[PDB]
Structures are given as structure tokens and as C-alpha cells.
Amino acid sequence: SNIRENPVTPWNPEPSAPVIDPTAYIDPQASVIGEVTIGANVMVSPMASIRSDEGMPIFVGDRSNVQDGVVLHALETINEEGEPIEDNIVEVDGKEYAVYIGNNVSLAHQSQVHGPAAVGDDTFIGMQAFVFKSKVGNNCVLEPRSAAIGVTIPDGRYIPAGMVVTSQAEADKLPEVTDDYAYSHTNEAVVYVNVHLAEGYKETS
Amino acid sequence: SNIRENPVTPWNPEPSAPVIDPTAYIDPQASVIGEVTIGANVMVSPMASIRSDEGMPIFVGDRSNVQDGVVLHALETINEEGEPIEDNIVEVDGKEYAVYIGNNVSLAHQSQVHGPAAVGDDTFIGMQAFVFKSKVGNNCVLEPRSAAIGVTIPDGRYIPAGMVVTSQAEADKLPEVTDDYAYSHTNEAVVYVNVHLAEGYKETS
Amino acid sequence: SNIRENPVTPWNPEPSAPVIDPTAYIDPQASVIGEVTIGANVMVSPMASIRSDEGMPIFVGDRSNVQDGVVLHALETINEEGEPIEDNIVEVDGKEYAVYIGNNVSLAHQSQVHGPAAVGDDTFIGMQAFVFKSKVGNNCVLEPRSAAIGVTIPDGRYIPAGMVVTSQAEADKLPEVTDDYAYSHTNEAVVYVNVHLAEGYKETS
Ligand SMILES: [Zn+2]
Ligand SMILES: [Zn+2]
Ligand SMILES: [Zn+2]
Numbered sequence: 001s002n003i004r005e006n007p008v009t010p011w012n013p014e015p016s017a018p019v020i021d022p023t024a025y026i027d028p029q030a031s032v033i034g035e036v037t038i039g040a041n042v043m044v045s046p047m048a049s050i051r052s053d054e055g056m057p058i059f060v061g062d063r064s065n066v067q068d069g070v071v072l073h074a075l076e077t078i079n080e081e082g083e084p085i086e087d088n089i090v091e092v093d094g095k096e097y098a099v100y101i102g103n104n105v106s107l108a109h110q111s112q113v114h115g116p117a118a119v120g121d122d123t124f125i126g127m128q129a130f131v132f133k134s135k136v137g138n139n140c141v142l143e144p145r146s147a148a149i150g151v152t153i154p155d156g157r158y159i160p161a162g163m164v165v166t167s168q169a170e171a172d173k174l175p176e177v178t179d180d181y182a183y184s185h186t187n188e189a190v191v192y193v194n195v196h197l198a199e200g201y202k203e204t205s
Numbered sequence: 206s207n208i209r210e211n212p213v214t215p216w217n218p219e220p221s222a223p224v225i226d227p228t229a230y231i232d233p234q235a236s237v238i239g240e241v242t243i244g245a246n247v248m249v250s251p252m253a254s255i256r257s258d259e260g261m262p263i264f265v266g267d268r269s270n271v272q273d274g275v276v277l278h279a280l281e282t283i284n285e286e287g288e289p290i291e292d293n294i295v296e297v298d299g300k301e302y303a304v305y306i307g308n309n310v311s312l313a314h315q316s317q318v319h320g321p322a323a324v325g326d327d328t329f330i331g332m333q334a335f336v337f338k339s340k341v342g343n344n345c346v347l348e349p350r351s352a353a354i355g356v357t358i359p360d361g362r363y364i365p366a367g368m369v370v371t372s373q374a375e376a377d378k379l380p381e382v383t384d385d386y387a388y389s390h391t392n393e394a395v396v397y398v399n400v401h402l403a404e405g406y407k408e409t410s
Numbered sequence: 411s412n413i414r415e416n417p418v419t420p421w422n423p424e425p426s427a428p429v430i431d432p433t434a435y436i437d438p439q440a441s442v443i444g445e446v447t448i449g450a451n452v453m454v455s456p457m458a459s460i461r462s463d464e465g466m467p468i469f470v471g472d473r474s475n476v477q478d479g480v481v482l483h484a485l486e487t488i489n490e491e492g493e494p495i496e497d498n499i500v501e502v503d504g505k506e507y508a509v510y511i512g513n514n515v516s517l518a519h520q521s522q523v524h525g526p527a528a529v530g531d532d533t534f535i536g537m538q539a540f541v542f543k544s545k546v547g548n549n550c551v552l553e554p555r556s557a558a559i560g561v562t563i564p565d566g567r568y569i570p571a572g573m574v575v576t577s578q579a580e581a582d583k584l585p586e587v588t589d590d591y592a593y594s595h596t597n598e599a600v601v602y603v604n605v606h607l608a609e610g611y612k613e614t615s
Pocket of ligand 3: 484
């Protein structure tokens with residue numbers, strides 16, 4: 001099966017299986033392993049790998065999409081001695097996650113979000129982009145081939161294509177999404193399409 | 206099955222199945238979905254995802270290759286009201302495509318060509334490279350990790366490794382492929398190898 | 411089967427099947443083809459593609475890991491006339507390889523090592539990184555999105571995130587890994603985790 005439990009390890013005494021909303025579509029050629037929660041109307045495309053086998057949950061919110069070849073994974077959140085590694089855990093609305101993906105988020109083809117990381121609602125993570133040890137705000141756009149490592153990206157900012165942002169001083173001065181910006185409406189269109197694709201693919205299974 | 210029809214959606218009243226030349230080899234661990242035409246002697250490697258589920262055809266020409274982890278997908282070409290979105294359609298030799306890949310084209314490992322896009326004959330798209338909203342000419346080389354977004358790349362030019370080209374002014378001044386250039390003969394070698402691999406893998410199926 | 415022989419071609423008269431240590435774990439959604447040797451306690455994750463179909467062996471040493479979406483492949487090492495192409499072969503400890511990955515090496519998610527290439531022991535190849543026509547020394551760190559093309563990386567150096575190194579003059583002046591460097595202990599942690607994951611996943615098969 002392509003939806004599987006995680007294994008017993010010294011930081012994982014009890015295997016967990018994914019919790020998947022009945023309205024989500026998981027492609028047969030995707031892989032979803034371990035302590036993962038997937039929300040309503042989510043589309044998970046071929047060759048995506050969502051792997052939660054190092055402690056703590058990976059959460060994917062409602063009406064989000066995980067496109068072809070995307071990888072979600074996380075650094076260890078609990079060491080062998082049972083002690084939580086707080087640097088590798090993100091907090092969102094009072095709860096702890098290894099990776100938190102909000103609602104109406106698009107993770108476009110071949111992107112990767114590696115824990116610890118959080119991605120806020122209505123954000124487009126572009127093709128081949130990379131997020132690691134970062135919190136990306138709501139209503140952001142990461143253009144194709146951009147990256148955020150070790151930073152907080154404020155709400156409503158974008159990262160231009162190819163830019164690798166590794167310092168908070170850079171992140172603070174990123175440009176703002178405006179109506180005339182080329183990707184200002186991209187995420188809403190992609191979410192609309194993917195919610196409809198999920199329903200159509202479900203009707204073929 | 207890994208060769209599948211696309212689903213019924215508001216922009217796709219009628220499902221389409223891929224049209225695949227009998228001399229092409231599609232690896233069992235590749236995914237090919239929807240309105241796709243694959244030409245003669247094409248090799249599609251493990252973990253490639255060719256997904257035509259947003260309207261209009263993805264075409265892969267004769268003697269081309271689609272290597273491991275490559276993704277082909279496209280933006281919507283027909284909106285819900287049946288109206289064609291002309292910005293997201295490319296025209297090649299009088300016909301309309303979401304993605305057009307010409308003859309003798311190599312799409313090397315982990316690259317991505319996202320529609321609207323066209324790639325001309327005898328072009329090497331290097332490892333991890335990215336093409337989106339662009340027309341790449343014939344006899345071009347995109348070196349590994351290069352990208353073309355929103356531009357036309359003239360025939361016989363190359364993009365150096367790691368360069369992300371987003372303006373036409375940049376694209377117009379790209380260097381020319383010459384006989385002494387390091388990748389000048391790369392595509393011909395890769396095409397020769399892949400046509401022979403396709404035949405060898407077909408003999409094991 | 412996802413563990414397969416390579417095909418008969420003009421440079422490969424005799425098919426070879428992978429040689430895999432009984433303590434290694436190969437995920438069912440990985441692909442391993444051809445003349446490949448995998449060492450003890452190696453973890454190969456979903457969507458990895460290890461493909462040795464152009465002559466010469468791809469070797470993955472003991473306690474190494476090949477994470478999700480990683481690709482290993484190599485340029486042709488033997489031409490049609492049976493003549494070895496020496497430029498495309500690396501030598502390590504008196505033996506010839508297309509790709510050599512040493513012991514305790516982490517190939518992180520979506521990275522790629524393309525032959526000819528060698529990666530020395532205790533090296534971290536970061537997420538989305540790229541190695542081609544290069545020898546990477548022991549105890550190195552390639553940060554996420556870095557690349558080494560056509561160069562030798564001395565022992566104990568790192569490449570900062572996003573940097574594409576294509577000249578030996580650049581490679582010679584790369585910074586050194588020190589105890590206070592952010593990724594100085596990353597590889598040891600990742601190797602420890604992956605050796606334990608391999609054993610846990612083996613207990614579920
Ligand atoms: Zn990871
Ligand atoms: Zn797409
Ligand atoms: Zn290759």
C-alpha cells in the first residue's frame with residue numbers, strides 16, 4: 001500500500017497511520033507515511049512523498065495541494081531519551097508540528113518543505129522552491145526556484161525567482177504582493193483548479 | 206495502471222487517454238495521464254510525471270527522452286465557460302499546445318517544463334533545469350540548474366549553469382553554442398543512448 | 411519488480427542485477443536498476459531512482475542514505491566499440507566506478523549525483539543539491555541548493571546554500587567546516603537516524 005504506518009524506532013514507540021479526510025485524493029503513485037493529517041479536498045499528485053517518520057505530525061490543511069514530486073519530511077523532534085527537541089518544532093495556534101501547511105496552500109511541482117517549517121494560508125510555494133527552518137506567512141508567493149532557509153517571511157511578501165533568502169535582514173525587505181504583481185492571483189486559480197481535480201480523480205477510483 | 210485518462214472537470218467534458226507510439230518505452234514507475242501524445246522511440250524513465258489534466262495537449266516528439274523525476278504539466282488552457290485562455294497556449298506549426306516538446310529533445314533528470322512552453326528540436330534541457338512561459342529554440346542547451354521564465358531563447362544559444370533568465374533583454378544576449386563549447390555534442394550523444402535504451406527496455410517487457 | 415536488471419544494449423552485452431546487502435532497506439516505491447552495489451544498513455527512500463544502465467557500477471557505501479526523489483545516473487563509460495571512455499570513469503582505491511558514494515554519506519531529498527562523480531565518506535549532500543563531473547572530499551557539506559560541476563572539493567569544506575561552483579579556483583577557496591558551523595554535526599545525526607529507520611522499515615516488510 002502507498003499509505004503506510006511509520007516504523008518503530010527509538011523515538012517512535014508506537015506506529016501511527018495517516019489521518020486522511022474522505023474528500024482528499026491521494027494518487028496511487030504518491031507515498032504518504034506515518035503521522036500525517038491531510039485535510040478536506042486536498043489533491044496529492046503522482047510522485048509526491050509525504051513522510052512523517054522522525055516524530056511529530058506533518059499537517060496539510062484544507063483545500064491545499066501537494067503537486068508532483070513534492071517532498072515533505074522533517075528533522076527529528078524527539079531524541080532517543082524521549083526529550084523533545086524544541087528547535088525542530090513549530091508552534092501554530094497552540095499546537096506543535098514538525099511541518100505545518102495551512103489552508104489553501106499550493107505546493108507546486110518539485111518543491112520541498114522540510115521541517116521545522118510552517119506555511120501560512122493562501123500561500124503559493126512555486127515550482128522547485130525550497131522552505132526549511134522557516135515560517136512563511138499568509139498570502140505569500142515563493143516564485144519558482146526561490147528558497148527560504150532559517151527565516152520568517154512576513155505576510156503578503158514575495159520572493160523573486162531564483163532568490164535564496166538566508167538572513168532575516170533580507171526577509172524583512174522583501175517586496176509586497178500587489179494587484180499588479182504577476183503572481184498576485186496565481187494561488188487562488190491553482191487552488192480552484194486543484195479542488196476540482198481532486199473531485200474528478202475521486203470519481204475515477 | 207500508470208497510463209491513465211484525465212478526469213471529468215468543468216474544463217474537460219470528455220476524458221482523454223494518452224496516444225503512445227508503439228516504439229516508445231514508458232517505465233512502469235513513470236506516470237502518464239490525460240491528453241498526451243508521445244512519439245516514436247521515446248524513453249520515459251522512472252519517476253517521471255507527464256500530466257495533462259488542465260486542457261490542451263502535451264506533445265513529446267520523436268526520439269526525445271523524459272528522464273527520471275521530470276515533470277511536465279500546464280496551466281489551464283480552457284476556462285470553465287469554455288473560453289480558450291490564449292496566454293496559456295503556444296502555437297507551433299499551425300497547431301495549439303499546452304506544452305510542445307520537439308524531436309530529439311533531452312529532458313534531463315529532475316528538470317521540469319511547465320506550460321505554456323515550447324522546446325525546439327535538438328535541444329538539451331539539463332539536469333534540474335526549469336522552463337515556464339517560454340519558447341526555447343532549436344539547438345539550444347540549458348545547462349544544469351539553469352532556468353528560462355517568460356522569455357524566448359533564440360536558436361543555438363545556451364544558458365550557463367545556475368543562471369535564471371527572466372527578461373528578454375537577458376535572453377537576447379545569451380552566448381552561442383560553438384563546436385568548442387563543452388555541451389555542444391551532449392544532446393546528440395544522449396539522444397543516441399536513449400533511443401537504444403528504449404529498444405533494450407522494450408525487449409524486457 | 412522495482413529492483414531490476416539493466417537491458418542489453420550495444421555497450422552492455424550482459425545484463426546485471428543489483429547487489430544489495432541484506433541489511434539494506436529499499437522502499438517499494440524506489441527504483442534500482444542495473445549494475446549497482448548497495449552496502450550495509452543503507453536506506454533508500456520513496457521515489458529515489460538509482461539507474462545504472464550506461465556501463466560501469468554505481469556504488470553506495472555502508473551506512474549511507476538515499477533520500478526521497480534522489481537520482482543517481484551516469485554518462486556512458488563504454489562506447490559501442492567496447493572502448494572505455496576514461497573521462498567518464500572515476501577511480502577510487504584502485505577500482506573504477508561511474509558513480510562512487512562512500513560510507514556514511516547522506517544524499518538528502520531531491521539531490522542528484524550524476525556520474526562521473528565520487529563523494530567521500532561522512533559527507534552531507536544537501537536538499538536539492540547537484541554533483542556532476544566532480545569529486546567531493548570526505549567530511550564535506552553541500553548546503554541545500556548548492557552545486558559542484560567539474561571540480562574537486564577538498565576534504566572538510568562546505569558550499570553555502572545556493573552557490574554553484576564550476577571552477578577549481580572557486581572550489582579551492584571554499585570555507586572550512588568548523589565546530590561552530592551550523593551543519594558541522596548534521597551528517598552524523600542524519601546517518602544515525604537513517605540506520606535506525608532502515609532497521610525499523612525492515613521489520614515491517
Ligand atoms: Zn528529511
Ligand atoms: Zn502545473
Ligand atoms: Zn543521466
